[PDB]
Amino acid sequence: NDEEAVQVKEQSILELGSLLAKTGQAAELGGLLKYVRPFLNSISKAKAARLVRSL
C-alpha cells in the first residue's frame, strides 16, 4: 500500500540525511527540511513533528 511507500520514504530520508550528515553537508541538509515540506502534510503531525525534531 501507500503506507509502506511512506515508511520506506521516511527511512530513506533518515538514510540520505545520515549520509549527508556523514559527508558534512550544511546547505543540502538544511534545505532538505524545506524540500520535505509537502511530504509532511500527507501524514499525521506526530511523525512530522518527530521528523522535524530528529533532523
Short mmCIF file of C-alpha atoms in Angstrom, two decimals:
data_model
loop_
_atom_site.label_atom_id
_atom_site.label_comp_id
_atom_site.label_asym_id
_atom_site.label_seq_id
_atom_site.Cartn_x
_atom_site.Cartn_y
_atom_site.Cartn_z
CA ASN A 1 0.00 0.00 0.00
CA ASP A 2 0.94 3.68 0.19
CA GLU A 3 1.78 3.49 3.91
CA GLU A 4 4.72 1.19 3.17
CA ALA A 5 5.95 3.61 0.49
CA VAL A 6 5.74 6.45 3.03
CA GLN A 7 7.64 4.31 5.56
CA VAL A 8 10.46 3.40 3.17
CA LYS A 9 10.47 7.03 2.02
CA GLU A 10 10.90 8.22 5.61
CA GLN A 11 13.68 5.71 6.28
CA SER A 12 15.21 6.90 3.00
CA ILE A 13 15.05 10.44 4.40
CA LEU A 14 16.84 9.27 7.55
CA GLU A 15 19.28 7.34 5.35
CA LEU A 16 20.08 10.16 2.90
CA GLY A 17 20.14 12.65 5.77
CA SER A 18 22.51 10.36 7.65
CA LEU A 19 24.84 10.16 4.64
CA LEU A 20 24.70 13.95 4.22
CA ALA A 21 25.48 14.31 7.93
CA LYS A 22 28.45 11.98 7.43
CA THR A 23 29.73 13.87 4.38
CA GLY A 24 29.47 17.20 6.23
CA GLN A 25 26.79 18.88 4.12
CA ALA A 26 25.15 22.01 5.56
CA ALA A 27 23.10 23.72 2.84
CA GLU A 28 21.74 20.46 1.42
CA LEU A 29 20.75 19.02 4.80
CA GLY A 30 19.41 22.42 5.86
CA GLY A 31 17.38 22.67 2.67
CA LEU A 32 16.08 19.10 2.94
CA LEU A 33 13.67 20.18 5.68
CA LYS A 34 12.31 22.74 3.21
CA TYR A 35 12.20 20.09 0.46
CA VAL A 36 10.17 17.64 2.58
CA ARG A 37 7.59 20.32 3.41
CA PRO A 38 4.83 18.97 1.10
CA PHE A 39 5.61 15.38 2.12
CA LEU A 40 4.92 16.02 5.81
CA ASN A 41 1.31 17.03 5.08
CA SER A 42 0.46 13.54 3.77
CA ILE A 43 0.88 12.01 7.26
CA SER A 44 -0.02 12.87 10.84
CA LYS A 45 1.51 15.72 12.83
CA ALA A 46 3.15 13.32 15.30
CA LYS A 47 5.52 11.70 12.80
CA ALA A 48 6.04 15.03 11.03
CA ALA A 49 6.94 16.85 14.25
CA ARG A 50 9.11 13.92 15.35
CA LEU A 51 10.91 14.06 11.99
CA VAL A 52 11.42 17.82 12.30
CA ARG A 53 12.86 17.36 15.79
CA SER A 54 15.02 14.44 14.61
CA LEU A 55 16.53 16.20 11.59
#
